[PDB]
Subunit: 462 residues, 4 copies
């Protein structure tokens, strides 16, 4: 059962129960692309915040009756309270401006406002979608404003806290293991010693530089397009609208949003989305290396490296009974792979602005929100289910430490490089110890070898 | 309300009405990454087919009783018939083998078989998840089989016919517009004439080459890992299982699946996924250009090219009243940018196999199906709501054709490049016509100009 | 010292001894971007062939006098014999059509033909760069023609032989190692057995599939734009020129070139470059894996896996004396990482056609030829200096084989998954053997265990 | 001709007159991959600065005699004055550590030092390449140090100044065209007016945001690995060496380099190269969009947009006489396509560290330096030959603007969206002005229309 709704193109049958109208219904039917309602909820939420703000600003500046503000406000509160989730059926793969999702908001607010005020759904709303709910706005400044609200919110409320969480565990493990001496590997080959603490201090430092790099991008990301309207000029905005609607968004979200310095840059590009996503990819490449190291170190438990123990959360294998695998490592490496591809998509799209508008907005927003959410989720999963539980396998570490022929490196400043190399080659060829061959070649006394080749004194300077 | 299921790690509380067991539930709780149940339904379907196939093969080779085959068979039928979708809650971002989704089928199939046979959830299944439903199988060979079944089925039944549909529209437009003489543009600058039909024949040709590139990758994609089990060796497989189970998958799917030539290549790599997705990315880069040319050609009405007219499907703009946008073009360019990204992800994951197993299966699987589906969807949408409706802007085409100073190129073989170059530069600097300056420079008679410079004669 | 050359835009000081003229000199001065003369020689060599074929076709079809054909052929023969390599100073980062490089061929051929014929540099050439050397031609068809010649030549003469050679070594090793039983690793954890032969047969299969995938893309790539001229219409070409010039190029190169089926596709895209480079990229990603497995398999010699011994070609380390690294594996992984980003560049540029011409020709050409050359060079280097010399570390393989608790998988069909899991978990927890704990649990007798748990019998069907 | 040099692996025939030794010759022969001597000159230069710094630090802390420092500094001073370019024959695609290039420096410094001291090639060098030139160093800390010196130097001396120079032209253009009203385009369709100045202000803003994003990465980039040695522990360094060698590098370069906070991160990753290249790729995608806009705006000159005039630097076309193309825009869009690809390679290699060492150092070095150099060179080129000469085509701007039906947007706040859409659709169907139809539909008076619809007032707020 459908009712008739109208736009400036003609009449459309709209499902009789739904708060949306003609332009929403056209979009729902004209873009059967991927799964239904794929436009991210975070973008709808951000729309709820900015549409409330536009109404509060427009009232303060004298161009919208308080009555209309109050009704738009209450409708926006209901969107924000996840009361109207089923009134947003549009996909990412629509018009590249997000005009159709902007009109999905305008139409649902107008009709929901009509019913709140005691009207019948289907009757001309007391609130006009374009003239009232969209007053002083474009899809061109609202959709970018929704993008930066959702993006900033997800980065500062989910992603950075989740990455800080893992960073703190890695630094905690660096201190916890500060006295466990293990063998270095370079090129996958036996190297000189370092503590398991030092190894983990690398991982902790990678995420600290990652957090800094993301934080460096937030000033650009907090700038909002709202007030540039169609082409950036602020056509049909009241004087002072730009600064005042930003203040309202800042106050509703509790986050430090300002009006964009340049509305042309803010419509014609998503450079801020590229800058922040670049930082998300940097952390993601770091996380890949960290998770890869942890699975290498935990490999075995008999025929691999086996230097660390990790929590055993589930049966690893349907055919190999008793197998346990590093599954959180794998989930982390898979997300990191996802973020690299998302970075290609965002980078490509970010180049493809024409004149006064970039019309890759939905695809940039969906890819950015996915990276930001998945990095958050997997950092929490990995910390809870792997990183907090990492412990050293003491005897395996000792066996692999005492084994390295490259312990010989401690004799470099005593007998020089060429003589140290003779010892290592000779031990290697003969299947003997460094100590045996240092003595046999008469290059070092038993005494001096035992004084000089001490792993625990090789993990700092002279 | 929960009930106790057991795995070889101990007891787990399971939602008492759900057909899954200990291992599904651990995964559901341990992998809270992205939206719930993100594992593609195409993979769950692929699993329905191969789990049925496994059971039928195992009974044929003497290692599974018929009674147990029929119960597994029935449960798989219900999975294919979309009766058990709520029984599959696991995410892409699980173990990189897909072990947890393989154990999701094994556990669901076993418990549902018990109930089909007259049992109750909460009792020991007459069918063992591992010894019976997972007989002669590993996560390592079933999950890549699922991947190829799903990938091959999406490409031949959805992606190719959608691309074929748009290709024939573009060829039909190339013939319909064969007599429409328009100006060519190179470097975005005015050039020599071609027909609109000729321009459209380039787009038609692009998707025909793209259709061949995709078809070339099908022989590798049609090959299935099933029979390699743990490491590629076929450990715990009966002799002849590899070929027999491929035949049942072929039969059940109606599609030409064969056993993989090398089960070690089939487990350690997803080079078939990289091969076929490179071809989807080729088609996507073509589609981007076509979609971009079409919105360039339709740009205006005043401030652009405006050489074609496109269907006007919806109001373009919440603030600019009456504006109409090439919105199907923009959906097609946004899909193409997604697929390029999906190619970076798949290529990177494809490189990261270790020893006997590539454990990036689900992210490669998810990114593949997304590219295949969205290319399918956007080609149908674009054909329906744009390509089928394109028509020339007849007066606009003639105005822009007759205005090109690079019509002077017709004079090359008569007066040489240098003399031709003087006519076009004098016309441009004086804001006059080629003809007026050919006469004022004394390089061409009026009568020779009119004979030699005929746009219709410059299109071959 | 300079001389004056002229183009349609005015007078230019040209280095007095060089055979290029005004347009080549303008491009050399106006595009100071990266190293001088970066335009690949393979593109100049392709231009040498197609310029000769164009002169020959033009005379056969009555529009170029034989005398001018002969002088052009001789200048073109000098370019192909590498006698004029210093006459091409233009960069990749010029006009997106490669117009400047086409005019570099036209100017050099014209001025060289003039001197061959007895004239001097500084005089007006008896052969006009545009009217004669460029007759029946555009940059828009010559440059893509140069790209396909250079690419197809490089793929069939260098890339495919290189990969075939390494494929054959890997097939040989598969046969040589067919009876060497080693432990499989899944998720990096101890799995069930396979032969070192089986593992290597995987590597051999990956490169056969990759060769098939490159070869599938050749039919598209052997199609030449030559004949489309300015926009694809073949304006200013005599009837039959497209087929005739393709035949001369087939003959001069000895490679199966044909005229493009659609000259609009041949000018407005380089989808054939995108098609073939995606196959090169497929191969690069397979090579990454093979190279990474081999260094993983060689790791140690005590702290790693160390199942294979590889050729030791040089000292590994300036500070760690006697260290030897898998350096060929590293070159292969680094090239694979280069090819993936080359594919990002080619795809992006692939999408960015406008109307009748794609003007990213040089960046596509350079990235393609680099990938094809590097893949060939590293497969040859890796075959000679690593793959040919790989041998098993037999005793290390035996140790790592016998220590795997997942040998218990052989018991699945005898006692079940749950009973087999009990044995492996008990062995793990106790630091004991499968065999001990199989007897200890009354699950399996000595005799049956010794019968059923045979690694040599776990590398095939039941 | 040859002489014998020796390494810990044996005797090598070295070209008699070359200052390199056994390890450089091995590498030269063992890695025949891509053109000869591909390792960037900037990496060798960086090595020059750091080897001299190491020698001075080593003397100050009493572990190298002043006499040996003086010789190392003299050989280092010959590398830095570009006198020994022919002594560095090694390729990018070597060992993934850059070991062979580290030993190339050590060998050439040793032997050139020996000859400077009055010795002869073929003699044992007075200075040992491992014990003296490489004292208190690994390849694992010197190669990353070379990379950061090279990367930091290139970005702040070439890339930032080039980008700043172009930004300043786009800002001067924004101010020069502040009063020129032109038609907006959104989705490539007629939109509302903005000034040509406001449009250029977007371009200027993009480069300003890009410059800030690049500078935010400099703090991480100026950290040097030097002092970490083999695995990061500073094994075989004297106390204070890390800090003191950083001061010498800062002194000799004149740039504020500091010792890395975490030497394990400085060896096991190139996260700082990922961080800075991300910012470079941001600026490239911005430059792509700017260059594409300028070529769209300049297109025609009679059957495109044609709103702006760009300088005419060369004949555009070999067949179409008098054609002139936007060739500098093309060079910039191709470089941008190159940098995006470079970002993929760098991101991939950045993820692929194992344990204590990332062994993709050369490929990350080469791709970084290419991006930084090409972005500098094309920004200077585009500025000099394109952007400084951009002028309005005033009559053509007015022609395309006065036309626009979306000037109707000025009526929204007076009559509402639905009435404004009637006017626009009726003018469109009838091919009449907005004014005629506004009056004729009885929706707006002549007086009110002329008052409310003023293009010049549509470039700002109500």
């Amino acid at each position: 059962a459908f009712r008739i709704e109208k736009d400036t193109m003609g009449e459309v049958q709209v499902p009789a129960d739904k708060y949306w109208a003609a332009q929403t219904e056209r979009s729902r039917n004209n873009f059967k692309i991927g799964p239904a309602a794929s436009m991210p909820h975070e973008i709808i939420e951000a729309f709820g915040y900015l549409k409330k703000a536009a109404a509060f600003a427009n009232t303060d500046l004298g161009v919208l009756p308080a009555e209309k503000r109050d009704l738009i406000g209450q409708a926006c509160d209901e969107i924000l309270a996840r009361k109207l989730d089923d009134q947003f059926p549009l996909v990412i793969w629509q018009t590249g401006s997000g005009t159709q999702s902007n009109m999905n908001l305008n139409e649902v607010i107008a009709n929901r406002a009509h019913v709140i005020n005691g009207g019948k759904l289907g009757e001309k709303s007391i609130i006009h979608p374009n003239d009232d709910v969209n007053k002083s706005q474009s899809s061109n400044d609202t959709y970018p404003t929704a993008m930066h609200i959702a993006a900033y919110k997800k980065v500062v409320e989910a992603t950075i806290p989740a990455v800080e969480r893992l960073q703190k565990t890695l630094a905690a493990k660096a201190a916890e293991f500060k006295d466990v001496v293990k063998i270095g590997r370079t090129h996958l080959m036996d190297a000189t010693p370092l503590t398991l603490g030092q190894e983990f201090s690398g991982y902790a430092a990678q995420l600290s530089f990652g957090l800094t790099a993301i934080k460096n991008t937030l000033p650009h990301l907090r700038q909002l397009a709202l007030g540039g309207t169609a082409v950036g000029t602020g056509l049909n905005t009241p004087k002072g609208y730009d600064v005042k609607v930003a203040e309202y968004i800042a106050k509703f979200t509790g986050l430090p949003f300002i009006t964009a310095e340049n509305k042309f840059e803010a419509l014609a590009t998503h450079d801020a989305i590229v800058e922040t996503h670049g930082a998300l990819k940097q952390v993601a490449m770091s996380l890949f290396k960290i998770a890869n190291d942890i699975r290498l170190l935990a490999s075995g438990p008999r025929s691999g490296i086996g230097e660390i123990l990790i929590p055993e959360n589930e049966p690893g294998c349907s055919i190999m009974p008793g197998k346990v695998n590093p599954t959180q490592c794998e989930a982390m490496t898979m997300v990191a792979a996802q973020v690299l591809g998302n970075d290609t998509t965002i980078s490509f799209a970010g180049s493809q602005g024409h004149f006064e508008l970039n019309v890759f907005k939905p695809v940039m927003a969906a890819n950015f929100l996915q990276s930001a959410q998945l990095i958050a989720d997997v950092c929490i999963s990995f910390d809870e289910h792997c990183a907090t539980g990492i412990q050293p396998n003491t005897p395996r570490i000792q066996h692999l430490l005492d084994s390295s022929l490259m312990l010989v490196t401690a004799l470099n400043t005593h007998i020089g490089y060429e003589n140290a190399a003779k010892i290592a080659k000779t031990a290697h060829k003969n299947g003997t110890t460094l100590r045996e061959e240092a003595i046999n070649l008469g290059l070092v006394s038993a005494e001096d070898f035992d004084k000089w080749v001490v792993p625990a004194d090789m993990v700092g300077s002279l």
